[PDB]
Amino acid sequence: GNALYFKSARNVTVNILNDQTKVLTQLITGPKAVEAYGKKFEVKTVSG
Amino acid sequence: DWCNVSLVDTSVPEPGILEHDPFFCPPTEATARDFLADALVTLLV
Numbered sequence: 001g002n003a004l005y006f007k008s009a010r011n012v013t014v015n016i017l018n019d020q021t022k023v024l025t026q027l028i029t030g031p032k033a034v035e036a037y038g039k040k041f042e043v044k045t046v047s048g
Numbered sequence: 049d050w051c052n053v054s055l056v057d058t059s060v061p062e063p064g065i066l067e068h069d070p071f072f073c074p075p076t077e078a079t080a081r082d083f084l085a086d087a088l089v090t091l092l093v
C-alpha cells in the first residue's frame with residue numbers, strides 16, 4: 001500500500017565493496033547520467 | 049506514351065524539458081548545541 005523511495009539532493013552512488021573496501025561494480029544515478037560501472041551487464045527474461 | 053503524362057504544380061503542404069518535483073527532504077538544519085552549562089547548573093546546585 002505504499003511506495004518505498006530513495007531521494008537526495010545529489011548523486012545516489014550505489015556501490016559494492018570487497019573485503020579491502022575497493023569498488024568492483026558501481027551504479028551512480030546522477031543528475032544527468034546514469035552510469036553502471038562494473039565488469040559486465042545483463043538483461044535476462046524469466047525463462048532464461 | 050500520352051496516357052501516363054503527369055502534371056504537377058505548387059501546393060500548400062503544411063504539417064524538450066525535464067523536471068520532477070518531490071515533496072520534501074530537508075537535513076538537520078541549525079546544527080549546534082551544548083550540554084555542559086545546564087549540566088554545570090544542575091550539578092552546581
Ligand SMILES: *[C@@H]1O[C@H](CO)[C@@H](O[C@@H]2O[C@H](CO)[C@@H](O[C@@H]3O[C@H](CO)[C@@H](O)[C@H](O)[C@@H]3O)[C@H](O)[C@H]2NC(C)=O)[C@H](O)[C@H]1NC(C)=O
Pocket residue numbers: 001002003
Ligand atoms: C508506484 O507506486 C506508487 C505508490 O503506490 C504509485 O503512486 C500512486 O499513483 C496513483 C495514480 O496517480 C495515485 O492515485 C491518485 O494520485 C493523485 C495524485 O497524482 C491523487 O490526487 C489521487 O487522490 C489519487 O491518490 C496514488 O495516490 C499514488 N500513491 C502514492 C503513495 O503517492 C505509482 O503510480 C506507482 N507507479 C506506477 C507506474 O503505477
Ligand SMILES: *[C@@H]1O[C@H](CO)[C@@H](O[C@@H]2O[C@H](CO)[C@@H](O[C@@H]3O[C@H](CO)[C@@H](O)[C@H](O)[C@@H]3O)[C@H](O)[C@H]2NC(C)=O)[C@H](O)[C@H]1NC(C)=O
Pocket residue numbers: 011013028029030031032033035
Ligand atoms: C555525480 O554524478 C555525475 C554524473 O556521473 C558526475 O559527473 C561526472 O563526474 C566525472 C568525475 O568527476 C567527470 O569526469 C571528469 O572529467 C574531466 C574532464 O571533463 C576530468 O578532468 C576529470 O578528471 C574527471 O575525469 C565528468 O565530467 C562529470 N560529468 C558531468 C556531466 O558532470 C559527478 O562527478 C558525480 N559527483 C559525485 C560527488 O559523485
Ligand SMILES: *[C@@H]1O[C@H](CO)[C@@H](O)[C@H](O)[C@H]1NC(C)=O
Pocket residue numbers: 051052
Ligand atoms: C502507366 O504505366 C503502367 C506501367 O506500364 C501501366 O500499368 C499503366 O496502365 C499506365 N497508365 C496508363 C494510363 O496507361
